[PDB]
Design a protein around this ligand. Structure first.
Ligand code: NI
Lengths: 61, 8
């Protein structure tokens, strides 16, 4: 009802102060997808939060 | 804009 669970398809290294770095296979909760391209996400694996490139993730159980 | 990165 607000859960938006995605899995990282590849690694992504942060390159701004607001990006989230993640490893392939991490599960993420999508907090805000307002921008369309870059989504605010929270890692279920690491507990870190930040923007992610939406093309690097796919919906997951 | 901020383009998305290319995919590996
Ligand atoms: Ni939900």
């Amino acid at each position: 009802g607000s859960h938006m669970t995605f899995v990282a398809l590849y690694d992504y290294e942060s390159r701004t102060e607001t990006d989230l770095s993640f490893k392939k296979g991490e599960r993420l909760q999508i907090v805000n997808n307002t921008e369309g391209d870059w989504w605010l996400a929270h890692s279920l694996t690491t507990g870190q939060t930040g923007y992610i490139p939406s093309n690097y993730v796919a919906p997951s159980d | 804009r901020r383009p998305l990165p290319p995919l590996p």
